[PDB]
Amino acid sequence: SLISALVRAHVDSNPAMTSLDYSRFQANPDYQMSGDDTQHIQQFYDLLTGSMEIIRGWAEKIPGFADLPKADQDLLFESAFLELFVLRLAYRSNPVEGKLIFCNGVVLHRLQCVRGFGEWIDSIVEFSSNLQNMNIDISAFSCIAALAMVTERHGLKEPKRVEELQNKIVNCLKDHVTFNNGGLNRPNYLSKLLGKLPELRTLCTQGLQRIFYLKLEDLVPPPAIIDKLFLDTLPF
Ligand SMILES: *[C@@H]1C=C2C=C(O)C(=O)C=C2N1
Numbered sequence: 423s424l425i426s427a428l429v430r431a432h433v434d435s436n437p438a439m440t441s442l443d444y445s446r447f448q449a450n451p452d453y454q455m456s457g458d459d460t461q462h463i464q465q466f467y468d469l470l471t472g473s474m475e476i477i478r479g480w481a482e483k484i485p486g487f488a489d490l491p492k493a494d495q496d497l498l499f500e501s502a503f504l505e506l507f508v509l510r511l512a513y514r515s516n517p518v519e520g521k522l523i524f525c526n527g528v529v530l531h532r533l534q535c536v537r538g539f540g541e542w543i544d545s546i547v548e549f550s551s552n553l554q555n556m557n558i559d560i561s562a563f564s565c566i567a568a569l570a571m572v573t574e575r576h577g578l579k580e581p582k583r584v585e586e587l588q589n590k591i592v593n594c595l596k597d598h599v600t601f602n603n604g605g606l607n608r609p610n611y612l613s614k615l616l617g618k619l620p621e622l623r624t625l626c627t628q629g630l631q632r633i634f635y636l637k638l639e640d641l642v643p644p645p646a647i648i649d650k651l652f653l654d655t656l657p658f
């Protein structure tokens with residue numbers, strides 16, 4: 423029941439792997455680089471806001487989420503955007519070829535993303551390599567994604583409703599794993615999957631550091647949506 427909804431949410435919020443536009447894909451480094459930085463910082467901001475709208479649409483397809491106070495929805499979405507963005511990008515990209523595929527089908531090489539993202543893009547590619555080396559199926563990935571957002575957050579109006587949705591999702595992922603791979607559970611696999619979440623939070627704080635650096639540089643000032651994201655995500 424829940425995993426079907428979660429997988430449909432994922433599928434509906436991801437680009438079909440046949441519409442990948444390799445038009446702005448450039449793999450020659452000598453050409454990969456010489457574009458003034460301004461354009462890359464803007465490209466960075468656009469990728470972030472474009473995936474903000476995509477992922478919010480995904481979040482709205484999570485059974486039970488929409489029944490939560492609108493303020494809780496905004497707190498969960500803003501608190502997890504960076505983690506969602508990093509997880510979804512790392513799951514659909516191709517780390518071995520150094521190819522990044524964003525929430526919209528654009529395929530860029532790592533060396534092109536380094537100009538805008540900073541070293542964080544390398545931390546992202548390493549995360550993609552680690553995540554894919556454990557070959558999570560789509561049902562499991564849709565559950566981890568749901569659990570990355572539907573989790574405890576300070577300043578929540580109704581924390582018990584969220585806690586209930588989280589338990590529902592955790593239990594759904596455990597049932598899928600146990601049924602799929604024999605009546606005998608895989609507690610160790612399960613713990614590695616849930617352990618992928620803290621790594622995601624850190625990748626995120628590393629995204630806040632990249633945004634903070636760009637705000638200080640003041641060359642390509644962060645647009646209103648990124649300014650708000652930065653201030654709203656600040657944990658203190
Ligand atoms: C991305 C930004 C975060 C904000 C929080 O409140 C967390 O708990 C984790 C985060 N990583």
Ligand SMILES: [K+]
Nearest residue numbers: 437438439440
């Ligand atoms: K496809």
